[PDB]
Specification:
Chain lengths: 216, 174, 144, 37
RNA sequence: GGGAUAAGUGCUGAAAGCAUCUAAGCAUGAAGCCCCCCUCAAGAUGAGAUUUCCCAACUUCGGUUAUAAGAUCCCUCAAAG
RNA sequence: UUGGCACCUCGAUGUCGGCUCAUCGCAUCCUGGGGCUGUAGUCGGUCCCAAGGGUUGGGCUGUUCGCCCAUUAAAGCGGUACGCGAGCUGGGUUCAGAACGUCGUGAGACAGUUCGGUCCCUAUCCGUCGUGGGCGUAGGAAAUUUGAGAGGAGCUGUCCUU
């Protein structure tokens, strides 16, 4: 079981051995370091905490997340590492295989590895029931005054209320999503890029977490 | 309980040891240990054992008969053992032994393998007869049932795994 | 003339007790603990204040049932979602979460009031024979 | 199996028994197998 | 895939010398049940855990104070709205 | 279901069908597990367990039904004010016009027919879907988290081989 953190760059295509067009997503997974190792003894569970992407060192009057705060700088320093923008825990990996301050390389994954990619999906803002919940529209003509409305939200005196889980307009997207059983097409060590077959959630520049597929 | 009243005669070779409710019986073939009913009281003689029920209540009467039988079975099992024989019927139905484990071919695309259990012996004769031998009557019975369950006998032609002395009802298909 | 004593926080003294659940029927243990928690065993018992004592229950895993309750006594909980009814048997609850089984049993015998909720918070239940409240210096209590 | 309120022996061989609190009939003839319900 | 089950199917077994899947005991058995998979989740007021950062003077000795780490106002913005 | 009764509502509890959105029961249509069979096999019949998921598009008619075309693993049956008109429609029905048959001396009338015919409302409270602020969580903070709970998902065909 392996895990790495990367940023989504975009999509492209690669030609397979038989000349099949393979839709791919380019992920850059440079600057991964094991910040901390969590153990059952101390934390009650085993995990490695990986910090990805170096951030600038602490300064006195930092006004942004670009510069590490004193708490963050200390945590990273314990691992003898530079402060990191993104930090995530991998429970799947074996703690013994890793040492604190160790670099996690893209070469950990190899071509043909089946992986699960986790990321936050693209935000869509306030969205109606048709787009958010894939509901059918009402008639567009024939006297209709019902087009993009959600429909009846209940029954009558029996229940005299709307049940929890009724599908209504609200904020859509910006949700954690895991796409399972994706494949590593290629690993570029020089550019620190992993090529994942298919597409993964979130905008370009978004954080992606790549893990060995849970289902095998 | 006439069964409960009947005494169990210990074979001279076999030795029965009672620790509280639990009883450990040692014989030439093997040693068997079980826990008998707490209420039942056991009187032991060199050549025989008697089980005694405290009350004539149904619960005591029921347990008395069972307790006697369980002790009797253990004693007989260690002395002589119990064996159940199963006979495969139908063309292409064969039994073979892979080490301790038994391999059964019974008109299936996949071969069926039954793993051997502790205190049980699987033996095959002619590839059409399988015998299960063990100290425990229950253990032999269970494994025999499992072997028989792999392919139960069909009514029309009698094809399947059956107990050697089992009777199968026969029907005419057409 | 009005002469009835009224207990108040200034004069109330709460003790700590340990009760062993081993070999005890759930309900019979439960009803006794409920009275101790509510101060019913004190002469200074006052309704509008908590005069009760803290109770530690140990060996909750070893609590007993009669008849076929282990399989036939079912706890039902609703999530407030349509079709959101969830059930686990008393026996399974004893295996998985014995502390909850005891806790819910006693709390169901306590009043559903602000005071009643407070009195239930004084109950500490443990599945094993060991508890972490040695500092409270609890006293063993034998159920009547 | 016959599931019926009236469970009774159909033939001489039929035997009335109780399993798990249910009146049942067992017999060599499979047709006469019964369970009260 | 796992655990426990339904209707079932048994093994051993008496009450009831026989018999009997059941009473004691022991197995097996469904898209179902509890998990396994995904998501939210400590206002879980029972408010949990780990790592790191900050740590002084006054004072009526009761406590206060602005400051620390940190975070905002305001401003340039978008992957967010 | 057709009724019986006339108990809440006549200072108003909108009524058929469809559309939108569902939700629940199981007496189960399909799929899963079984028993018996007048079960050779392939198929079936009947009964038991089982509500997890699934359960199509058309022609005619206002239709619900129902018949039919073509499918499907299957085209389940019921409750929810015959679910849902402050969510939609308004074809039927249930105003004023007109006409046919019929009845009436007539004015008119007909669970007979025919054509035409105004569907209002800026959401206070609960409920629901989203999204912030306060305080708490015995110092003040930055990150990473455990999971008590809760939600989601859960369906199937055909073909090849044996
Ligand atoms: Mg449409
Ligand atoms: Mg319009
Ligand atoms: Mg009859
Ligand atoms: Mg009257
Ligand atoms: Mg009114
Ligand atoms: Mg049923
Ligand atoms: Mg209606
Ligand atoms: Mg309405
Ligand atoms: Mg109209
Ligand atoms: Mg009329
Ligand atoms: Zn018969």
């Amino acid at each position: 079981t392996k895990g790495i953190l990367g940023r989504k760059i975009g999509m492209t295509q690669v030609f397979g051995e038989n000349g099949e067009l393979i839709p791919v997503t380019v992920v850059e997974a440079k600057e991964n370091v094991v910040l901390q190792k969590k153990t059952v003894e101390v934390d009650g569970y085993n995990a490695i905490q990986v910090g990805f992407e170096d951030k600038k060192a602490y300064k006195k009057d930092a006004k942004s997340n670009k510069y590490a705060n004193k708490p963050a700088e200390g945590h990273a320093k314990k691992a003898d590492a530079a402060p990191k923008r993104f930090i995530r825990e991998f429970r799947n990996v074996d703690v013994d295989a890793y040492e604190v301050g160790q670099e996690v390389s893209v070469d950990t994954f190899v071509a043909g590895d089946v992986i699960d990619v986790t990321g936050v999906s693209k935000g869509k803002g306030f969205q109606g029931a048709i787009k958010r919940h894939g509901q059918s529209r009402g008639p567009m003509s024939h006297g209709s005054h019902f087009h993009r409305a959600p429909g009846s939200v209940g029954m009558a005196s029996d229940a005299s209320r709307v049940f929890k889980g009724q599908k209504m307009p609200g904020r859509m997207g910006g949700n954690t999503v895991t796409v399972q059983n994706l494949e590593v097409v290629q690993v570029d060590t020089e550019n620190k890029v992993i090529l994942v077959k298919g597409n993964v959630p979130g905008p370009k520049k978004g954080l992606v977490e790549i893990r060995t597929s849970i289902k095998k | 309980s006439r069964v409960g009243k009947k005494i169990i005669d210990i074979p001279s070779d076999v030795t029965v040891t009672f620790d509280g409710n639990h009883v450990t019986v040692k014989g030439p073939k093997g040693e068997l240990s079980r826990t008998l009913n707490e209420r039942m009281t056991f009187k032991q003689e060199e050549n025989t054992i008697e089980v005694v029920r405290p009350s004539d209540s149904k619960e005591d009467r029921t347990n008395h008969g069972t307790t006697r039988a369980l002790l009797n079975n253990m004693v007989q099992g260690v002395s002589q053992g119990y064996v159940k024989v199963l006979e495969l019927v139908g063309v292409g139905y064969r039994a073979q032994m892979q080490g301790k484990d038994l391999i059964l071919n019974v008109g299936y695309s996949h071969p069926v393998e039954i793993k051997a259990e502790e205190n049980i012996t699987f033996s095959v004769e002619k590839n059409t007869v399988v015998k299960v031998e063990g100290i425990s009557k229950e253990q032999v019975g269970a494994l025999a049932s499992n072997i028989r369950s792999v392919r139960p006998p069909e009514p029309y032609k009698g094809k399947g795994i059956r107990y050697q002395g089992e009777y199968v009802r026969r029907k005419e298909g057409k | 003339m009005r002469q009835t004593f009224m207990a108040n926080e200034s004069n109330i003294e709460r003790k700590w007790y340990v009760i062993d659940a081993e070999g005890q029927t759930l309900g019979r243990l439960s009803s006794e603990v409920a009275s101790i928690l509510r101060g019913k065993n004190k002469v200074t018992y006052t309704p509008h204040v908590d005069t009760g004592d803290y109770v530690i229950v140990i060996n909750a895993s070893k609590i007993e049932f009669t008849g076929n309750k282990e399989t036939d006594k079912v706890y039902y909980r609703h999530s407030n979602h349509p079709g959101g009814i969830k059930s686990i048997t008393a026996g399974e609850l004893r295996r998985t979460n014995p502390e909850r089984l005891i806790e819910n049993s006693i709390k169901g015998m306590l009043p559903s009031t602000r005071l009643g909720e407070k009195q239930g918070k004084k109950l500490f239940v443990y599945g094993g024979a060991e508890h972490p409240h040695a500092a409270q210096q609890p006293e063993n209590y034998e159920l009547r | 199996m016959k599931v019926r309120p009236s469970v009774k022996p159909i033939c001489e061989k039929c035997k009335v028994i109780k399993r798990k609190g249910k009146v049942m009939v067992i017999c060599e003839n499979p047709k006469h197998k019964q369970r009260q319900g």
